Every structure is written in structure tokens, then in C-alpha cells.
């Protein structure tokens, strides 16, 4: 009808699905937020808002949308660059970009476009993806070392590598490695590794408690409030639209590619242009409330489905579990150390870089490598300096 496929069977499936997808979203929404440079709060609220509305208004019932880790990476550059231009409205501006990219998605969908962003070749997707993975890893380079990220970032960071060398925090590195370890080697499929890693890492600051280490600090309790546009007449503004153009585009490609995975596991098919409209709305709303930009998650989505999610009620439920978790359990986050999140973010990076493809045309091999290099260069560029 006017919304995504919602019906009142799969109450059990949709409930187990939403709640599994909420606990998965939680460690990486914290991670992506911090990494973003916007609050940890910006990460969560995107996860709720993009999640909810895209679930309410899209065309893929099983689909779990959220700040996705090529959304985070792109968005993180944008924010950096817009703060460097205007430290008083940079963030705000960036949220306005999230909104604008929302709008773009709405249009690409409203305009018989969703169809042919499927025409992307694997080699390109794979280059982009391994490209984004590398960046994410290097961002965590600095959190791993136990000092905060420099302003490059990653040019700032690589610039700052030298005596970032010996200002080290050994316990933090130890903490970060420990986290990676927890995720990497637990055979012994619920108790998802990331939530396990997250929880143990915190509490293992009953071993390393006497030491000082960085944690997510306290943070805005409870409800979020409307930040309408600063579009700002900027010398920025021309830069904002190119930014909204990429972000919107990227968010469709990521939302869609997954929606194909959603198709696979379910024997169902889905509606692209409606999905893009769902993504648009979810993003517009997220920006309107300081959330990050999102798209369809594919870690979030498969786990929802295996739990047995079958209806957009999965999504709705997910976003509301999250919602109460944020507004009631805000105090817990504050003790979660940054190293643990770095570790988590690190492996997400590691996990999205494509390496089988490493170790079949001589063309593709090359295209990929270039797309990789191209994708780190533009990233490095987009951050002012
Ligand atoms: C020539 C012009 C330069 C081109 C440069 C830009 C390339 C285009 C961006 C592609 C977006 C691909 C997004 C793919 C995200 C889907 C990821 C996915 O479906 O699976 C994730 C999994 O975790 C991973 O192993
Ligand atoms: Na995805």
C-alpha cells in the first residue's frame, strides 16, 4: 500500500528478528558515531531513525537499514571538511547534507531510476569496498595507539604517526587487540561476537581498572531535538550538494545491493524505487534530528532473517528496541572504552575488505586495484587537506 509490507503474523519471527538486529546495530552504531566525529549519539539516532522510517516506508520487508560503514566513512570526511570550513555550523551543515542526500534518494526512486544502479560490475563494488575497509582500519590506527584521532584524518593521522609512535598507551592497544581477538576466535551464533566483545572489553576494565583509559564519555541523555537546515549561503554550499549527491547515490547502491541479498535468503523479490524512497525518508528524518546517514546493512539484515524476520515489523521492532535502549540505558555507554570500539570498528573494516579476490580477467584485476586506489585517494581528498 503506502508503506512497506507490515502484517501481524511473524509476531514471533519479527520479534526475534528485530531484537537480534538491534543488539547487532548497537556495538557498531556506537563505533561509527565516534569514528564519525559527530557524537556517539549521532550514530545511535541514525540507527533508530534511518532504521525505522526506511523500514516503515521501503520496499524490502526483511531490510535492516543503518549507518553502514561506507556511509560512515563518507560522512566522516564531509563532517571533517565542513567543520574545518565553519567550526560553528560544520556539523549542522553536515546534518543538512544528510537531509539533502535524503531528498536525492527520494527523487532517484520517484523517478524510475532504482532499476539500473544494479548494472554496477562486481569488480567495482569490490574495489570500493576494499577501499573503504582500508580507511576504516587506518582511522582505528590512532584509537589503537591509545591517543585520539588527529584532524587529517588519515593524512592528519599518517602525518602524526611519527611521535604518535612513542606517546603510546600499551594497555589500550592491548585492549584493542584483545577485542579483535574475542570477535575473531569464539566459535563457542547467538551471543553475537560484537556484543560479546563489547561487553567483555568493558568489564575487563576490572582487570585494567587501576589504569586510565579513554571511554565514551557521558552524553546527551534521552530525546533528540530538531536541527532544521543551516544550508548557509556557503562557499560551502556548492560543496554541500556534490556531497549530498555522492552520499545519496552511495546510499542507494548500498541499500539496494543488500536488498538483493535480502531477496536471496527469502526466495522473495523486492521493490527498488520504493526502497530508495524509504531510504530517502529515513535519511531526511535522521538528519533532521542529528542522526547519521544510513542505508541497508547486510550484517544487520541477514541476522534479522535467520532470526526469522519476514515483515517490515522486524524493522519497526528493531528501531523501537534500540530506542528504549538508548533512552533508558544511556548511562552504560559512558564506561565503554574507545579502544574496544576501535577494535570492533577495526574488524568491520578488516571484514569488508575483499580477499579471495586477492588470494578472472586481467581487466577486472586492474579495474579493482584502481578503484581501490581511487577510493582511498578521494576519501583522503574529501577531508579538507
Ligand atoms: C569510475 C568511477 C569511480 C568509481 C568509484 C566509486 C565506485 C562506486 C561505489 C560502489 C558502491 C558499492 C557499495 C557496496 C556495498 C555493498 C556491500 C555488501 O553488499 O556486502 C557487504 C559485505 O560485508 C562485504 O563483504
Ligand atoms: Na549493505
Report if residue 206 sits inside a domain.
Answer: yes
| Total number of domains in the chain | 1
Please report which ligand is nearest the Cα atom of 294. 2
Report how far residue 298's alpha carbon sits from residue 321's, in angstroms, rounded to the nearest whole number.
Answer: 19
Could you tell me if the CB of 259 is within 6 A of ligand 1? no
Of the residues 253, 370, 378, 380, which should be mutated to test ligand 1's pocket, given the most ligand atoms within 8 Å of the CB? 253
| Distance between Cα 220 and ligand 1 center (Å) | 33
What letter does residue 202 receive in the DSSP assignment?
A: H
Report how far residue 68's alpha carbon sits from residue 275's, in angstroms, rounded to the nearest whole number.
Answer: 16
**C-alpha cell at position 146:** 591509545
Could you tell me if the CB of 124 is within 6 A of ligand 1? yes
Three-state SS for 328-343 is: HCHHHHCCCEHHHHHH
Report if residue 237 sits inside a domain.
Answer: yes
Contact (Cβ atoms closer than 8 angstroms) between residue 346 and residue 180: yes
Domain that holds residue 212: 11-382
Contact (Cβ atoms closer than 8 angstroms) between residue 32 and residue 72: yes
Could you tell me if the CB of 371 is within 6 A of ligand 1? yes
Tell me the angle at which helices 71-85 and 122-145 cross, rounded to the nearest 10 degrees.
60
Ligand 1 atom closest to Cα of residue 299: 23
Report how far residue 356's alpha carbon sits from residue 354's, in angstroms, rounded to the nearest whole number.
Answer: 7
Q: Which residues are annotated as a binding site?
A: 68, 254, 258, 296-298
Report if residue 348 sits inside a domain.
Answer: yes
Q: Which residues are annotated as a binding site for hydrogencarbonate?
A: 68, 297
- Count the residues in the chain: 385
Give Cα 125 distance to the centre of its chain: 17
Contact (Cβ atoms closer than 8 angstroms) between residue 201 and residue 182: yes
Report if residue 142 sits inside a domain.
Answer: yes
Report if residue 3 sits inside a domain.
Answer: no
Report if residue 1 sits inside a domain.
Answer: no
Cα distances (Å, whole numbers) of residue 162 to 158, 175, 338: 8, 22, 21
Contact (Cβ atoms closer than 8 angstroms) between residue 43 and residue 294: no
Report if residue 6 sits inside a domain.
Answer: no
Specified resolution (Å): 2.8
Report if residue 219 sits inside a domain.
Answer: yes
Amino acid at each position: 500500500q503506502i508503506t512497506n509490507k507490515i502484517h501481524f503474523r511473524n509476531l514471533q519471527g519479527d520479534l526475534f528478528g528485530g531484537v537480534t538486529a538491534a543488539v547487532i546495530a548497537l556495538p557498531m552504531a556506537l563505533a561509527f558515531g565516534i569514528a564519525s566525529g559527530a557524537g556517539a549519539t549521532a550514530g545511535l539516532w541514525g540507527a533508530v531513525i534511518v532504521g525505522f522510517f526506511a523500514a516503515l516506508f521501503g520496499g524490502t520487508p526483511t531490510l535492516i537499514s543503518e549507518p553502514t560503514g561506507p556511509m560512515t566513512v563518507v560522512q566522516t570526511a564531509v563532517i571533517a571538511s565542513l567543520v574545518a570550513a565553519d567550526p560553528d555550523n560544520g556539523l549542522a551543515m553536515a546534518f543538512t547534507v544528510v537531509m539533502m542526500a535524503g531528498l536525492f534518494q527520494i527523487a532517484f526512486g520517484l523517478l524510475k531510476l532504482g532499476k539500473y544502479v544494479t548494472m554496477m560490475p562486481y569488480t567495482v563494488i569490490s574495489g570500493f569496498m576494499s577501499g573503504i575497509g582500508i580507511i576504516l582500519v587506518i582511522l582505528q590506527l590512532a584509537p589503537f595507539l591509545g591517543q585520539a584521532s588527529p584532524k587529517g584524518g588519515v593524512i592528519g593521522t599518517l602525518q602524526a604517526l611519527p611521535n604518535l609512535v612513542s606517546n603510546v598507551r600499551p594497555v589500550e592497544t592491548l585492549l584493542a587487540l584483545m577485542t579483535v581477538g574475542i570477535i575473531w576466535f569464539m566459535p563457542s551464533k547467538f551471543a553475537p561476537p560484537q556484543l560479546v566483545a563489547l561487553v567483555l572489553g568493558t568489564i575487563i576494565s576490572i582487570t585494567l581498572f587501576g589504569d586510565l583509559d579513554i571511554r565514551r564519555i557521558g552524553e546527551i541523555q534521552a530525546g533528540l531535538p530538531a536541527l532544521q537546515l543551516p544550508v548557509f549561503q556557503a562557499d560551502q554550499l556548492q560543496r554541500m550538494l556534490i556531497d549530498a549527491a555522492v552520499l545519496g547515490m552511495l546510499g542507494c547502491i548500498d541499500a539496494l545491493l543488500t536488498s538483493v541479498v535480502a531477496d536471496s535468503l527469502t526466495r522473495t523479490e523486492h521493490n527498488s524505487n520504493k526502497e530508495l524512497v524509504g531510504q530517502g525518508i529515513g535519511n531526511v528524518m535522521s538528519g533532521l534530528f542529528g542522526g547519521l546517514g544510513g542505508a541497508g546493512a547486510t550484517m544487520g539484515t541477514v541476522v534479522n532473517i535467520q532470526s526469522g524476520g519476514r515483515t517490515a515489523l522486524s524493522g519497526l521492532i528493531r528501531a523501537m528496541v534500540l530506542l528504549v535502549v538508548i533512552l533508558g540505558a544511556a548511562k552504560l555507554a559512558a564506561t565503554i572504552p574507545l579502544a574496544v570500539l576501535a577494535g570492533i570498528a577495526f574488524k568491520v573494516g578488516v571484514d569488508i575488505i575483499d580477499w579471495g579476490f586477492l588470494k578472472v580477467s586481467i581487466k577486472g584485476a586492474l579495474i579493482m586495484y584502481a578503484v581501490i586506489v581511487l577510493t582511498v585517494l578521494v576519501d583522503l581528498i574529501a577531508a579538507v587537506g
